[PDB]
């Protein structure tokens, strides 16, 4: 009765949803078979013999990542038809997966999503996992947004996106895929939580004491934050928040939807049990520049709306006392037309532990989604890198060959110049 449908697109989407659904099986009673030897109805459907089928679709164009999960430990967990594969990948190309490869896949993915949504009583929203720098997550997800907006409309569409990192990057044409993805996510996504891989590298080196992390060490943190976002959907709490709750509490204007995610206790088993950490510790940890998971500093920008999600053994009096230190601090600046500032949500369930993971078992935690002006610097840097490439017309013939026009880059640069002007005019007195 409180269901949401998660959609994973691309290699980043599948490799994040794997950790997410490990957490969902672990903190419920669900074995990797699916047997269990408002809680579980939201994310797991029921088969009368006692089986549980997750409400997720795994979409990718190359078959490697998704056909790996059909031969793994969780092979019996997912429905066979809910894993969608293709023959040819988009090859780091937005045009291929948006025009000539995504054309013949979306009539199956929309059919599977509608078949998923017809088994639901009350649908709360969608969670979409993808990446900007790819070709699948940049192209095919972006077309899927309008294709499901047409026949669903006013339902919530939350976005979880891997924004391109400022310094490190894994491709050359990633400014192109990051620039024309935002043509449709601006008019179709309700809210877009952004996480930077470089910043999670910095956290896994700095907060937790590991060097040389793998992608699974990043997906574990991302899955913990994702489960902390939707924790109130499944578990009882004193102050329950919904999927539609932070779509009206974090975005003041329909074109600026980009908050920043932050998990406060990121600590190993070697270090967790030598100190207390109750409310003021984790709440003061959330508002630090070091623990920010997008490589932009909120000290540059102005805080517009902060959404604090508490989980575990938490009393609201200490929550107010911890917000006192934040509001009294002068190094944290809010915009002048948000004297309120915060949205709070308190949950009973403590975060679960992960065997094979890296985070320790702690009694309580807090995850923060804060919309700030300081992401405009990342937009300015990325637009600089785009028009550094576009003046010389580098890597353009592939886009124009796969059913595009040359002027579509011009529209994108114009739209994001307008978005930068919007970010400037919001933050003025």
């Amino acid at each position: 009765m409180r269901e949401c449908i998660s959609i994973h697109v691309g290699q980043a989407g599948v490799q994040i949803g794997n950790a997410c659904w490990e957490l969902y099986c672990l903190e419920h009673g669900i074995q990797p078979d699916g047997q269990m030897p408002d809680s579980f109805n939201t994310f797991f459907s029921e088969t009368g013999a006692g089986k549980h089928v997750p409400r997720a679709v795994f979409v990718d164009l190359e078959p490697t990542v998704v056909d790996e999960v059909r031969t793994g430990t969780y092979r019996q967990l997912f429905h066979p038809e809910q894993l969608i594969t293709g023959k040819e990948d988009a090859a780091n190309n937005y045009a291929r997966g948006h025009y000539t490869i995504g054309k013949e896949i979306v009539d199956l993915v929309l059919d599977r999503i509608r078949k998923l949504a017809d088994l639901c009583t009350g649908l709360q929203g969608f969670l979409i996992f993808h990446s900007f720098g790819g070709g699948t997550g940049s192209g095919f997800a972006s077309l899927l947004m309008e294709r499901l907006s047409v026949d669903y409309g006013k339902k919530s569409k939350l976005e979880f996106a891997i924004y391109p990192a400022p310094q490190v990057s894994t491709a050359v044409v990633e400014p192109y895929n990051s620039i024309l993805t935002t043509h449709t996510t601006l008019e179709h996504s309700d809210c877009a939580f952004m996480v930077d891989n470089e910043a999670i590298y910095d956290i896994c080196r700095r907060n937790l004491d590991i060097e040389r992390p793998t992608y699974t060490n990043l997906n574990r943190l991302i899955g913990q934050i994702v489960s902390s976002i939707t924790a109130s959907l499944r578990f009882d709490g004193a102050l329950n928040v919904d999927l539609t709750e932070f779509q009206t509490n974090l975005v003041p204007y329909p074109r600026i939807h980009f908050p920043l995610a932050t998990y406060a206790p990121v600590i190993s088993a070697e270090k967790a049990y030598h100190e207390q950490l109750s409310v003021a510790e984790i709440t003061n940890a959330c508002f630090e520049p070091a623990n920010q998971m997008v490589k932009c500093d909120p000290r540059h920008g102005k805080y517009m709306a902060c959404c604090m999600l508490y989980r575990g053994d938490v009393v609201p009096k200490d929550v107010n006392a911890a917000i006192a230190t934040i509001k009294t601090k002068r190094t944290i600046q809010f915009v002048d037309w948000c004297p309120t500032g915060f949205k709070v949500g308190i949950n009973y369930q403590p975060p679960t532990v992960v065997p094979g993971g890296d985070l320790a078992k702690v009694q309580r935690a807090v995850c923060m989604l804060s919309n700030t002006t300081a992401i405009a610097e990342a937009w300015a840097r990325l637009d600089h890198k785009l028009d550094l490439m576009y003046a010389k017309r580098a890597f353009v013939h592939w886009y124009v060959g796969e059913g595009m026009e040359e002027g579509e880059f011009s529209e994108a640069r114009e739209d994001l110049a307008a978005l930068e002007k919007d970010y400037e005019e919001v933050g003025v007195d």
Partner: protein, 426 residues
């Protein structure tokens, strides 16, 4: 004898009135399963005020429970007293409001009121004699602020002469649990002033300071604050249920408190509030309830009454106590600090005495206070609303649901008329 309806809206309404029905069933001697196990014959006699008698000797509360989300319904059924409520009075929606007054008042809160109205009419046609209605809700949400105000309007249309009460949870001065809280507080207060006869403003940080200062608790739960609220909610219906030397219902309290039709915003308080380890040493005497019932920090609204003037005062007393040192103390509290009382009304204090205390206390006193210091709340609310309105912050979540800017302007102007009218007596 005359019987009272209870309305609950959203998380505030459901939790606060769940604690309310728990403490009423405690005081009237009803167990979690609904059967009478009490001893005194006074406990059972006026049980028709709040309860309906079923077959087999058990009693069902006269409450209606609403919310747009089904989670808090199963949350309130699983409590210690969740089995006392009638299952057909659980009227819930399938999708929530999401801290939106617009979709809680026009879009999603409108199509479900056509069943809450049926439930209320069905229960009130079996009503022997309807005194009035009670409603606990929140002004900072989408259910209690929107659907609650819609319910108040659609009941005032149907039953005009019955007394409407409201135990609203006003937004806190420092911690705002919602960024869009002024957009719901303003548009709910603008609807409250034309649709209620009595309204009590209850803050959350005021309750925190009351519980830490008096009960000496460093970490109270939400149930403790709901207990403190419902102690006043039960403290105004004592004379309807128990004998007393000087009775006063809610209508009689309304007559002796409001001098003008648009002045019905009060700040409540409880007199006996001491720690466990300092309650066997203290002699609970009549002066010691007055001495801290009128203290400036014994208010559940975050407004200091010494900064304003007391228009009217209500004091409802419970327990075995003489009528000389009641009136003597109420005169002494007026004669000394006369600078805090308006002089164009001679008597500010209304006195009622009931002869049965709450369970666990020997004597008790409930406070209702009409003050011109309540303009400190709406001044702050209007300041935040006008800071958030000149930029169209979060306005597209409101205008897209069937609204317009003129409704916002006419609500802000109504509250500004309220704050302009309050300052005339100070």
């Amino acid at each position: 004898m005359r019987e009272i309806v209870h309305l609950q809206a959203g998380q505030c309404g459901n939790q606060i009135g769940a604690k309310f029905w728990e403490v009423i069933s405690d005081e009237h001697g009803i167990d979690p399963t609904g059967t009478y196990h009490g001893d005194s014959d006074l406990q059972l006699e006026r049980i028709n005020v709040y309860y309906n008698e079923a077959t087999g000797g058990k009693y069902v509360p006269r409450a209606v429970l609403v919310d747009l989300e089904p989670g808090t319904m199963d949350s309130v059924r699983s409590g210690p007293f969740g089995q006392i409520f009638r299952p057909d009075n659980f009227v819930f929606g399938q999708s929530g409001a999401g801290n939106n007054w617009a979709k809680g008042h026009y879009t999603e809160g409108a199509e479900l009121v056509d069943s809450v109205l049926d439930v209320v009419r069905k229960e009130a046609e079996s009503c022997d004699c309807l005194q009035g209605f009670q409603l606990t809700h929140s002004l900072g949400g989408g259910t209690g602020s929107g659907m609650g105000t819609l319910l108040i309007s659609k009941i005032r249309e149907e039953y005009p002469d019955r007394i409407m009460n409201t135990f609203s949870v006003v937004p806190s001065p420092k911690v705002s649990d919602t960024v869009v809280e002024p957009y719901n507080a303003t548009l709910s207060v603008h609807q409250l002033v034309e649709n209620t006869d009595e309204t009590y403003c209850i803050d959350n940080e005021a309750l925190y300071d009351i519980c830490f200062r008096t009960l000496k608790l460093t970490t109270p739960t939400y149930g403790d604050l709901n207990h403190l609220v419902s102690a006043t909610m039960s403290g105004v219906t004592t004379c309807l249920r128990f004998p007393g030397q000087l009775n006063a219902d809610l209508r009689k309290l309304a007559v002796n408190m409001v001098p003008f039709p648009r002045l019905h915003f009060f700040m409540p308080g409880f007199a006996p509030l001491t720690s466990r380890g300092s309650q066997q040493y203290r002699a609970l005497t009549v002066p010691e309830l007055t001495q801290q019932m009128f203290d400036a920090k014994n208010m559940m609204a975050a407004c200091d009454p010494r900064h304003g003037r007391y228009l009217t005062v209500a004091a409802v007393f419970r327990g075995r106590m003489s009528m000389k040192e009641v009136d003597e103390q109420m005169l002494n509290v007026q004669n000394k600090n006369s600078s805090y009382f308006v002089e164009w009304i001679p008597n500010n204090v209304k006195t009622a005495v009931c002869d049965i205390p709450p369970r666990g206390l020997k004597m008790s006193a409930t406070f209702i206070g009409n003050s011109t210091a309540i303009q400190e709340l709406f001044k702050r609310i209007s300041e935040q609303f006008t800071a958030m309105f000149r930029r169209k912050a979060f306005l597209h979540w409101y205008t897209g649901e069937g609204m317009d800017e003129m409704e916002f302007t006419e609500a802000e102007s109504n509250m500004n008329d309220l704050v302009s009218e309050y300052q005339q007596y100070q």
